[PDB]
CSV table of N, CA and C and ligand atoms in Angstrom, one decimal:
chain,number,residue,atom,x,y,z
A,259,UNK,N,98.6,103.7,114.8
A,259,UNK,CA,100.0,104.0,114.8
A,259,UNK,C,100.2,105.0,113.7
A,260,UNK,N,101.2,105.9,113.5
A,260,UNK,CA,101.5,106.5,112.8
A,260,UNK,C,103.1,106.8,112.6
A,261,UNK,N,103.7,107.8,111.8
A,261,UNK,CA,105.2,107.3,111.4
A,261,UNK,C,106.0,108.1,112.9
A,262,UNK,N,105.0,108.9,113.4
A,262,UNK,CA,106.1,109.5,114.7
A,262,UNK,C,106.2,108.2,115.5
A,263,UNK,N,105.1,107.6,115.8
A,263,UNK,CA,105.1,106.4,117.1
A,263,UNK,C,106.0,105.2,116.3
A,264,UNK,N,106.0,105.3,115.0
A,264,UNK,CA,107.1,104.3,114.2
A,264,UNK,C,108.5,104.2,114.6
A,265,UNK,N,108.6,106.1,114.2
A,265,UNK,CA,109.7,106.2,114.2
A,265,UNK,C,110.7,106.5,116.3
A,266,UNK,N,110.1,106.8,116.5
A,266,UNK,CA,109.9,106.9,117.7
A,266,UNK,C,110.2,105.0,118.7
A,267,UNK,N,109.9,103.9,118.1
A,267,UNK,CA,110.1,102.8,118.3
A,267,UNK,C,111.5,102.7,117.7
A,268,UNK,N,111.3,102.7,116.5
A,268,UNK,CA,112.7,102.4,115.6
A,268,UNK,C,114.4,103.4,116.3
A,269,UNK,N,113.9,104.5,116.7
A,269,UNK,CA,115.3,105.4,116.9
A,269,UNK,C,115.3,105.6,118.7
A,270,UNK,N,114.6,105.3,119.2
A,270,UNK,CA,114.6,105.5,120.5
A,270,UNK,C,114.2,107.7,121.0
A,271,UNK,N,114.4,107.5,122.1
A,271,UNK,CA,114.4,108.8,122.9
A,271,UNK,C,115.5,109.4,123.6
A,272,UNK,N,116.9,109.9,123.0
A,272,UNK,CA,117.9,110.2,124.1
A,272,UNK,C,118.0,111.8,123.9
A,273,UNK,N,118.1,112.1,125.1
A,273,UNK,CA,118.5,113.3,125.6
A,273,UNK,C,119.7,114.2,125.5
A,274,UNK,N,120.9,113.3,125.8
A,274,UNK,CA,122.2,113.7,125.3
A,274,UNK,C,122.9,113.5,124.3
A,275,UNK,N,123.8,113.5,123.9
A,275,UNK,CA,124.4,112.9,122.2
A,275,UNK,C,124.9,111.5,122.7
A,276,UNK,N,124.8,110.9,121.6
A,276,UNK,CA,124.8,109.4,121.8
A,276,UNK,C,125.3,109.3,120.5
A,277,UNK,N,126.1,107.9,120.5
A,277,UNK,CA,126.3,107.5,119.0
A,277,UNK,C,125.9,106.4,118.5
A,278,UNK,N,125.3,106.5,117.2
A,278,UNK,CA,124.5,105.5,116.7
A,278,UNK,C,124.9,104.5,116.5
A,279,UNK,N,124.4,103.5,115.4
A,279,UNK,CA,124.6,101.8,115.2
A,279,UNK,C,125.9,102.2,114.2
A,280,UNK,N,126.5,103.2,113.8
A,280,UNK,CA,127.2,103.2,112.8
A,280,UNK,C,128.7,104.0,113.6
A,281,UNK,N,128.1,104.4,114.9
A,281,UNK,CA,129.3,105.4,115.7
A,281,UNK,C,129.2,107.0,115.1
A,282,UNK,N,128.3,107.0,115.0
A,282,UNK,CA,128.1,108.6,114.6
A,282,UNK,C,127.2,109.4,115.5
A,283,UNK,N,127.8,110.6,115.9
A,283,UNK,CA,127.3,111.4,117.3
A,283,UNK,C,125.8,112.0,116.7
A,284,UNK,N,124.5,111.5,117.6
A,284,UNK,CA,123.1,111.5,116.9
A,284,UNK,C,122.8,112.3,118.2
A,285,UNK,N,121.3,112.7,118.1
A,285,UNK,CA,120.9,113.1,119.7
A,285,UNK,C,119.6,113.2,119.4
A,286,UNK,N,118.6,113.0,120.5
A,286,UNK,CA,117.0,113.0,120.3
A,286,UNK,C,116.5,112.0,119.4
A,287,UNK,N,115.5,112.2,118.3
A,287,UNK,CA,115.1,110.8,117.9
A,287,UNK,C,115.7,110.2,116.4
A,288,UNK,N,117.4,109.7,116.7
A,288,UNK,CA,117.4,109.8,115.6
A,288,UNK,C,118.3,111.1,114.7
A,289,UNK,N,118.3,111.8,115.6
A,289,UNK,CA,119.1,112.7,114.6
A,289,UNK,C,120.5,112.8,114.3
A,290,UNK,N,121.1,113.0,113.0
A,290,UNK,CA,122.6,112.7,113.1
A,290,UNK,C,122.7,113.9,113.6
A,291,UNK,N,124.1,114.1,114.0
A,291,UNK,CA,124.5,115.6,114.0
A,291,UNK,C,126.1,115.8,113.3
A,292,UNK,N,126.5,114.6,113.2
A,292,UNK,CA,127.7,114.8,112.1
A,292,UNK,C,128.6,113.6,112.5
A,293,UNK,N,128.8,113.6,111.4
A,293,UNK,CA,129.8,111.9,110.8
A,293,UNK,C,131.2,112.1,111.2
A,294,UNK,N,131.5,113.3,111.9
A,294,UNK,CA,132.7,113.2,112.4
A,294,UNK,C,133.0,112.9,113.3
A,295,UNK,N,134.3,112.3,113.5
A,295,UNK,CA,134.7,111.8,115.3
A,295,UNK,C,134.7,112.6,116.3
A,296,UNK,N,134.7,113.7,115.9
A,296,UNK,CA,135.0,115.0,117.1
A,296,UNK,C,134.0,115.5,117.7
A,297,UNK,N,133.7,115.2,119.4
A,297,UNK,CA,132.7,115.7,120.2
A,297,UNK,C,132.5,116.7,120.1
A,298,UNK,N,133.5,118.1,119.8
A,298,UNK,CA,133.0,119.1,119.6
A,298,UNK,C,132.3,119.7,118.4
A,299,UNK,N,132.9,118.8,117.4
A,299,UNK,CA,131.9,119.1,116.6
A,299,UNK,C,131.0,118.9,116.5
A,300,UNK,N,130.6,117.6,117.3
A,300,UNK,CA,128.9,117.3,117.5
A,300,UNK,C,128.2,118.5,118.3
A,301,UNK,N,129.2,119.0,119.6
A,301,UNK,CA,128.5,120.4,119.9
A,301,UNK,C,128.1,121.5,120.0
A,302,UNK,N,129.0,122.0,118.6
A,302,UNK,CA,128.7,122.5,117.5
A,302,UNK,C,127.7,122.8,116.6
A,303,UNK,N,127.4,121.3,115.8
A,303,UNK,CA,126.5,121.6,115.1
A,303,UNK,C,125.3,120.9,116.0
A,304,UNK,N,125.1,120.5,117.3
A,304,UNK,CA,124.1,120.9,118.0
A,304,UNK,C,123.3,122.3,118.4
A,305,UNK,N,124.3,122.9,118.7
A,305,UNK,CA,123.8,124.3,119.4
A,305,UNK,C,123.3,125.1,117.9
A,306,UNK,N,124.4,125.2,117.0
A,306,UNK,CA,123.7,125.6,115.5
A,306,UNK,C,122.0,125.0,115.4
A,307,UNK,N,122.0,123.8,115.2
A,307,UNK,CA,120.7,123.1,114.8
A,307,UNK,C,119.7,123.4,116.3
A,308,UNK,N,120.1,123.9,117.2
A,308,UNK,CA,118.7,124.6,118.7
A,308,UNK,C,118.6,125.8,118.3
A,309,UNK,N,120.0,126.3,118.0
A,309,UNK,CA,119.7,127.8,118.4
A,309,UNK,C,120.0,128.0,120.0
A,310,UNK,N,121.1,127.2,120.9
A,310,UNK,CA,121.5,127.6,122.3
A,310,UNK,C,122.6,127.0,122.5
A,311,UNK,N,123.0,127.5,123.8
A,311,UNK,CA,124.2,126.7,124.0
A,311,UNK,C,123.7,125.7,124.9
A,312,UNK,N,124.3,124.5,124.2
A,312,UNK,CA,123.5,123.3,125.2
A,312,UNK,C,124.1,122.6,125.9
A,313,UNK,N,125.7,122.5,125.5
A,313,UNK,CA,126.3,121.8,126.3
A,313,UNK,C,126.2,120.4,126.3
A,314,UNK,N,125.5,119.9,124.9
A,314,UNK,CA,125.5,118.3,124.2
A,314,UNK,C,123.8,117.7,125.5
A,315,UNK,N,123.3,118.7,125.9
A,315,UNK,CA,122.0,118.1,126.5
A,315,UNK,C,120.7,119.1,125.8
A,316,UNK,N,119.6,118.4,125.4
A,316,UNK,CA,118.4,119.2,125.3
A,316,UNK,C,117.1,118.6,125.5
A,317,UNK,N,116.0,119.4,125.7
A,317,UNK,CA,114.8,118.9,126.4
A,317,UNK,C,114.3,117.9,125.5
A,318,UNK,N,112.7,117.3,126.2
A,318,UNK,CA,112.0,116.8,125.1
A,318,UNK,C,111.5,117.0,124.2
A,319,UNK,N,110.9,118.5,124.3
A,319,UNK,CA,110.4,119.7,123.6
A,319,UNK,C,111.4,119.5,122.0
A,320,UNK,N,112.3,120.1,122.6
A,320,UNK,CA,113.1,120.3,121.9
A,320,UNK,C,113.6,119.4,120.7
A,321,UNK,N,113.9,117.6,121.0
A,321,UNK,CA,114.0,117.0,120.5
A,321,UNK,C,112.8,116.7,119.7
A,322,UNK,N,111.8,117.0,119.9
A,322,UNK,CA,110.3,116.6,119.2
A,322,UNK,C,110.6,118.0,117.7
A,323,UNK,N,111.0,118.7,118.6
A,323,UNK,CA,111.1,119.4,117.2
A,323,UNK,C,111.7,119.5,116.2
A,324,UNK,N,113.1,118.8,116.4
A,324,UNK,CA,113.8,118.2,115.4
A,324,UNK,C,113.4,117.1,114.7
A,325,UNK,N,112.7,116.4,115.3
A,325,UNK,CA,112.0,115.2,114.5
A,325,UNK,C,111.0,115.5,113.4
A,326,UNK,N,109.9,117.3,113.9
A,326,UNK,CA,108.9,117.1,113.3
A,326,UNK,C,109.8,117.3,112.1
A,327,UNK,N,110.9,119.0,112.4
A,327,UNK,CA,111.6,118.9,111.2
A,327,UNK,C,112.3,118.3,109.9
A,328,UNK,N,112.8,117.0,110.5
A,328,UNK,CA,113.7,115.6,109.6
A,328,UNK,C,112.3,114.8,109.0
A,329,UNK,N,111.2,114.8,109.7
A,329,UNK,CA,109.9,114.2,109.0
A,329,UNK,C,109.3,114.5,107.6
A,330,UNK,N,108.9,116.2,108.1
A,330,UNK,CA,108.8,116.9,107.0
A,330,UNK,C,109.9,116.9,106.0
A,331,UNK,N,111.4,117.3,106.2
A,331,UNK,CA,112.2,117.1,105.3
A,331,UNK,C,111.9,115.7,104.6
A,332,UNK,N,112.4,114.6,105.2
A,332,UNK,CA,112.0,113.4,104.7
A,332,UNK,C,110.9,113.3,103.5
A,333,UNK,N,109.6,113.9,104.0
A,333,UNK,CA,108.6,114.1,103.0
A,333,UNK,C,108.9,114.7,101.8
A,334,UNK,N,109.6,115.8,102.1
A,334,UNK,CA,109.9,116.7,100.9
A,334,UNK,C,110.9,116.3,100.2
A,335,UNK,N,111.6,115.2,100.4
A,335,UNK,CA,112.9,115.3,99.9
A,335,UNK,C,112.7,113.5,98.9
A,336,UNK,N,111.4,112.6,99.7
A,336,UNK,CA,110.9,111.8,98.3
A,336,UNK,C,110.0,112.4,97.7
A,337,UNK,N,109.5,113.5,97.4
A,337,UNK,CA,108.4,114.1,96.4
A,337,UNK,C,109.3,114.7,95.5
A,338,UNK,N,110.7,115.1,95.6
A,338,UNK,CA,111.4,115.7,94.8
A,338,UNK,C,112.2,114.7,94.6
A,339,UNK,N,112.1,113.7,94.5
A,339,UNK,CA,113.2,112.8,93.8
A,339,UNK,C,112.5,112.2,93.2
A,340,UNK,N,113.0,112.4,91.8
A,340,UNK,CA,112.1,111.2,90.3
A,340,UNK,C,112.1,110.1,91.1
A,341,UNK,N,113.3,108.9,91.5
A,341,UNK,CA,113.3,107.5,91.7
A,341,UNK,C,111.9,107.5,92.7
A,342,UNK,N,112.0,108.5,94.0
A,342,UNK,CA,111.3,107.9,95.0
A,342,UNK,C,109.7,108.2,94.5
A,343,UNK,N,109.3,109.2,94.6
A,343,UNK,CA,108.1,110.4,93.7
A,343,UNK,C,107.1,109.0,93.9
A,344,UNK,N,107.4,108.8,92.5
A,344,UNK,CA,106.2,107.7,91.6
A,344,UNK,C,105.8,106.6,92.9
A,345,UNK,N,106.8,105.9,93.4
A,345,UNK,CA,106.9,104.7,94.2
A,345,UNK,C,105.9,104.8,95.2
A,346,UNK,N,106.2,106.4,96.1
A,346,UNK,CA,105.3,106.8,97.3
A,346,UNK,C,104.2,107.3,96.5
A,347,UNK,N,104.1,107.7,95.6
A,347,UNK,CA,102.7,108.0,95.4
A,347,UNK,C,101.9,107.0,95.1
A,348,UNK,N,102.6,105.2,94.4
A,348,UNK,CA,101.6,104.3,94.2
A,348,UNK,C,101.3,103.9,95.3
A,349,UNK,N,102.4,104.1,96.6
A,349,UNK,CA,101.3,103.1,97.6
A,349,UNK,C,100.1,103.9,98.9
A,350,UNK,N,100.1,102.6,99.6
A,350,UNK,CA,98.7,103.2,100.1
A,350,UNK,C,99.6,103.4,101.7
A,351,UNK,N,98.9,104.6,102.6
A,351,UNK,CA,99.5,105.4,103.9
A,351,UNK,C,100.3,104.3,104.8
A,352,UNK,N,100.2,103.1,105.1
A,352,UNK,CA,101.1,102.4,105.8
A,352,UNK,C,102.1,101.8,105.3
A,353,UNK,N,102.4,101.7,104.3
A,353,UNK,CA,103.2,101.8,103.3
A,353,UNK,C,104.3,102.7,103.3
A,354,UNK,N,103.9,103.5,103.2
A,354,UNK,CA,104.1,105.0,102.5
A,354,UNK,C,105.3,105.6,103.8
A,355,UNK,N,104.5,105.2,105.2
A,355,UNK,CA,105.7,105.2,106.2
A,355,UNK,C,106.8,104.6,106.2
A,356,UNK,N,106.4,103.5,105.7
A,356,UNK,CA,107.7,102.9,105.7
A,356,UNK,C,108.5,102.8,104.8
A,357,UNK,N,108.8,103.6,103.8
A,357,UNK,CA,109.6,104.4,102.8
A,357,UNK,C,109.8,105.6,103.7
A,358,UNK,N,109.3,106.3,104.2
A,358,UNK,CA,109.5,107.5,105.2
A,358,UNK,C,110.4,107.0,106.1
A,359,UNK,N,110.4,106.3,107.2
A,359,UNK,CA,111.5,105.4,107.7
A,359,UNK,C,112.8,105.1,107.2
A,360,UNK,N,112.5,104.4,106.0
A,360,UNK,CA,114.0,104.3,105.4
A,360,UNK,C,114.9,105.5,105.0
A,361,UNK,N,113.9,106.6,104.1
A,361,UNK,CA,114.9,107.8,104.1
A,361,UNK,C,115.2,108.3,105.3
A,362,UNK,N,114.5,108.6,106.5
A,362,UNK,CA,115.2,108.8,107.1
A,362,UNK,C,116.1,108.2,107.7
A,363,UNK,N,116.0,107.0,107.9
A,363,UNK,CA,116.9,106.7,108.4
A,363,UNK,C,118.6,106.2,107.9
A,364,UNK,N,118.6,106.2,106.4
A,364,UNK,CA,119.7,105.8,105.2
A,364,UNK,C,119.7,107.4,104.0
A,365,UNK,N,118.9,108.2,104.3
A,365,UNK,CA,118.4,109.4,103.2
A,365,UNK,C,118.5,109.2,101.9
A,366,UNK,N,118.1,110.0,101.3
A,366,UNK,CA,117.2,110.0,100.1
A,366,UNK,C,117.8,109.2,99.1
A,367,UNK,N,119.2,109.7,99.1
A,367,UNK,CA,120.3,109.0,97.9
A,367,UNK,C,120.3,107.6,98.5
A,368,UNK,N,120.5,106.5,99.7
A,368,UNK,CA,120.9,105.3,100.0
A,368,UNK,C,119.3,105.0,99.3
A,369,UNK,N,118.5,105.0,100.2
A,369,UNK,CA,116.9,104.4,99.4
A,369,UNK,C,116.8,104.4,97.9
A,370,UNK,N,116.9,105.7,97.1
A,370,UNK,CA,116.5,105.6,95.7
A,370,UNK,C,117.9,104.7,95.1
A,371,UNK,N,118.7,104.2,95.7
A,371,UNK,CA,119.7,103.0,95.4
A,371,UNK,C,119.4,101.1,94.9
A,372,UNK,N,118.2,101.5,95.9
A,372,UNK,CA,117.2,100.3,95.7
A,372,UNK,C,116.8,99.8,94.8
A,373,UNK,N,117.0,100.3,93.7
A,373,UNK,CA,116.3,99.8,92.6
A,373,UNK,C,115.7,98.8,92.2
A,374,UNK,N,115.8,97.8,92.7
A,374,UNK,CA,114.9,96.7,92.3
A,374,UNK,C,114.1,96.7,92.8
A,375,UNK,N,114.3,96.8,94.5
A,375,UNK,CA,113.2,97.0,95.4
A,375,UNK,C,112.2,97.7,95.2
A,376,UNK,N,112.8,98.9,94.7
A,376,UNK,CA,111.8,100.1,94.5
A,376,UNK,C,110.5,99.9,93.1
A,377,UNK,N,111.7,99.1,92.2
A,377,UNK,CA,110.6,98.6,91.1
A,377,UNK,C,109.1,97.4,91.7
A,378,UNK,N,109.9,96.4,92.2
A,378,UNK,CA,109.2,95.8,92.6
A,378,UNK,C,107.7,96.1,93.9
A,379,UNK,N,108.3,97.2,94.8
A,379,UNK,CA,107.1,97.7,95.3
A,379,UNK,C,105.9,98.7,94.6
A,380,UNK,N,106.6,99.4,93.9
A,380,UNK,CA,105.9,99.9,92.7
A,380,UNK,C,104.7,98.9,92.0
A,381,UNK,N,105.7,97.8,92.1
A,381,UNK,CA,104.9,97.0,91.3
A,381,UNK,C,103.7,95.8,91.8
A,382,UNK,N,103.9,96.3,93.3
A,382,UNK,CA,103.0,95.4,94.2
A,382,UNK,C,103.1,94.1,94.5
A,383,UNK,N,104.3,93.7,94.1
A,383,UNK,CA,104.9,92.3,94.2
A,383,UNK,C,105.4,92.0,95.5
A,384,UNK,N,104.5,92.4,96.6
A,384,UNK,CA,105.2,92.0,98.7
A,384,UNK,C,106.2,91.4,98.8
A,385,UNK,N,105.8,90.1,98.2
A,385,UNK,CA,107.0,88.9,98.8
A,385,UNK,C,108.2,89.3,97.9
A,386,UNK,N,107.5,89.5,96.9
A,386,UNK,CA,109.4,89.7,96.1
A,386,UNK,C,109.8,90.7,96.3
A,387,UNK,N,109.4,91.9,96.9
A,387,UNK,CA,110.3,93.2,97.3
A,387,UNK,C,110.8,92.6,98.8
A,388,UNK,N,110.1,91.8,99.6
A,388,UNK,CA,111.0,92.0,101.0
A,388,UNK,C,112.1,91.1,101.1
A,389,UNK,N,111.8,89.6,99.9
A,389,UNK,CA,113.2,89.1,99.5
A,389,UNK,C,114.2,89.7,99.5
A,390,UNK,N,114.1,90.8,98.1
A,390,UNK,CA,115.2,92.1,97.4
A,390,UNK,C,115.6,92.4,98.9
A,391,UNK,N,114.7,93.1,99.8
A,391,UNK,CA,114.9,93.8,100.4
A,391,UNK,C,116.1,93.9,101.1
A,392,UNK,N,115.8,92.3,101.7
A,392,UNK,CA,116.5,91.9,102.7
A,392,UNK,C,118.0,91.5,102.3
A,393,UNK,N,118.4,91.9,101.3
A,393,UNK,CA,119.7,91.0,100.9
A,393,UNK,C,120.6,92.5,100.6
A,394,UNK,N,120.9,93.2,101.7
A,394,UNK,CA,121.5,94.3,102.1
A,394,UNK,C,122.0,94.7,102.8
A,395,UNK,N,123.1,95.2,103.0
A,395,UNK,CA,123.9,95.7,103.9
A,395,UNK,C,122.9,96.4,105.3
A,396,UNK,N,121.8,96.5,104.7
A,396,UNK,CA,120.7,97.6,105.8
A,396,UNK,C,120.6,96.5,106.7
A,397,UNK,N,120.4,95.6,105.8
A,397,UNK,CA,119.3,94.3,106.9
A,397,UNK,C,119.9,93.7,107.5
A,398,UNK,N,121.8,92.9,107.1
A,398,UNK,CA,122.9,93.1,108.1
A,398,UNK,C,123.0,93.4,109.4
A,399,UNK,N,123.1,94.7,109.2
A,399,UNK,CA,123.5,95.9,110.4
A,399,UNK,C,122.6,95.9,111.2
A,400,UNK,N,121.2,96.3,110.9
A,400,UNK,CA,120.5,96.4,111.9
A,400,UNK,C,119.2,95.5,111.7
A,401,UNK,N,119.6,94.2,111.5
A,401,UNK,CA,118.3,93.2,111.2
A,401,UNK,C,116.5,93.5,111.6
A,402,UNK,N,117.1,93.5,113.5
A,402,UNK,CA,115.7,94.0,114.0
A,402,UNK,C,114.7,94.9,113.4
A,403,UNK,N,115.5,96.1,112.7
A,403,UNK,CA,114.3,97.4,112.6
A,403,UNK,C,114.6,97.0,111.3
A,404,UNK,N,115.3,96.6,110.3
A,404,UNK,CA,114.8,96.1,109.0
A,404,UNK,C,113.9,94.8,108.8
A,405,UNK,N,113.8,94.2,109.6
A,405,UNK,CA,112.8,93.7,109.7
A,405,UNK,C,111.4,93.9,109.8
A,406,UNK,N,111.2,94.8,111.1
A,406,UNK,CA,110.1,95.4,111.3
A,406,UNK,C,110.0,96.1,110.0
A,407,UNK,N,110.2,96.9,109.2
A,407,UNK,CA,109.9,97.9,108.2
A,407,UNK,C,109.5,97.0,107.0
A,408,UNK,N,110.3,95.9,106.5
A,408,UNK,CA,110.0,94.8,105.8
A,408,UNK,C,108.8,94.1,105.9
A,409,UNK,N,108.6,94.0,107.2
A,409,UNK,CA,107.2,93.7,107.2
A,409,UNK,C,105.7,94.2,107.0
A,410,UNK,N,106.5,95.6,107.4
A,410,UNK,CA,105.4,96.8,107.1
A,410,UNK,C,105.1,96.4,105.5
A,411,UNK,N,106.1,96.6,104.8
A,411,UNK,CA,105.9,96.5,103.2
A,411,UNK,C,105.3,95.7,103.0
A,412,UNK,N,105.5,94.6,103.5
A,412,UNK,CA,105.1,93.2,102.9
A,412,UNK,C,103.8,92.8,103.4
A,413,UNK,N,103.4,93.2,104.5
A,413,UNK,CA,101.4,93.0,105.0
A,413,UNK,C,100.6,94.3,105.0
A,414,UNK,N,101.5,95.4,104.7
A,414,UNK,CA,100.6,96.5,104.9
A,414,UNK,C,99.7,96.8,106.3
A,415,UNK,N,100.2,96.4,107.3
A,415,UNK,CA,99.9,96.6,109.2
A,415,UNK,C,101.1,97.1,109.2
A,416,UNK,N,100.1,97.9,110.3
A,416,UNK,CA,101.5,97.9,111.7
A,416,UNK,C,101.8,97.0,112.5
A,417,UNK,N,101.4,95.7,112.0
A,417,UNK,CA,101.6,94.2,113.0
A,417,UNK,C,102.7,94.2,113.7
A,418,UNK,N,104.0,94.7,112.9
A,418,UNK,CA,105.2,94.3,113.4
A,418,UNK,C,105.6,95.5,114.4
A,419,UNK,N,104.9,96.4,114.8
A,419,UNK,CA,105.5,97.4,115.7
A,419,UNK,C,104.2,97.3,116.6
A,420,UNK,N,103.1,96.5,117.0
A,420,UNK,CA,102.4,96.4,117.5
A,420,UNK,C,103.3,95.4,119.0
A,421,UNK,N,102.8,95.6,119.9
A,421,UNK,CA,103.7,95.2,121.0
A,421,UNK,C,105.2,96.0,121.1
A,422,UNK,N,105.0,96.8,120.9
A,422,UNK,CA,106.2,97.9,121.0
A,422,UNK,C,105.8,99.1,121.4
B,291,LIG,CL1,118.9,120.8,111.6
B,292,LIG,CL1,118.3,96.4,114.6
């Protein structure tokens, strides 16, 4: 497994603009396209972010590209953050996704929020970071996939995305 087939479980595959677990107009895997209520503005900064007029529909191609994009950003955006940096650099690659996951999915600022958590994994303590973890508005909302990711932390497998 790796963080595309992660993430790829975790955000699904849609084609048209859809709105997420929070009512915000997303499209492809995961991607926001803006926190505003206004469908045109979602088609808007759709066609800005292809480069066409799409008319709020785009291929698969197309969505894969966005993703590799928000992945990479993701990457680049905990190596330049002091809080996150150190954290992902102590752990080991399946791990490591799933701090990748969470930025993207809450970004950089919600994650490096975590502070305990973040100490705590740092500090290799499993069980007591996915306690922390879990006692958050994240885990709330969308239990299922904080779940899965929690567990990633906590056994170091992809156990929990396995049958998916
Ligand atoms: Cl973009
Ligand atoms: Cl969920």
């Amino acid at each position: 497994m790796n963080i595309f087939e992660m993430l790829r479980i975790d955000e699904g595959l849609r084609l048209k603009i859809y709105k997420d677990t929070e009512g915000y107009y997303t499209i492809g895997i995961g991607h926001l396209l803006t926190k505003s209520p206004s469908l045109n503005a979602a088609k808007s900064e759709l066609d800005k972010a292809i480069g066409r007029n799409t008319n709020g529909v785009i291929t698969k191609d197309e969505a894969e590209k966005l993703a590799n994009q928000d992945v990479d950003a993701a990457v680049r955006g905990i190596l330049r953050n002091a809080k996150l940096k150190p954290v992902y650099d102590s752990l080991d690659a399946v791990r490591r996704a799933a701090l990748i996951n969470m930025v993207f999915q809450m970004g950089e600022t919600g994650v490096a929020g975590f502070t305990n958590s973040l100490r705590m994994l740092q500090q290799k303590r499993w069980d007591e970071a996915a306690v922390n973890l879990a006692k958050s508005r994240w885990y709330n909302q969308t239990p299922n996939r904080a779940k899965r990711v929690i567990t990633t932390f906590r056994t170091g497998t992809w156990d929990a995305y396995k049958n998916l």
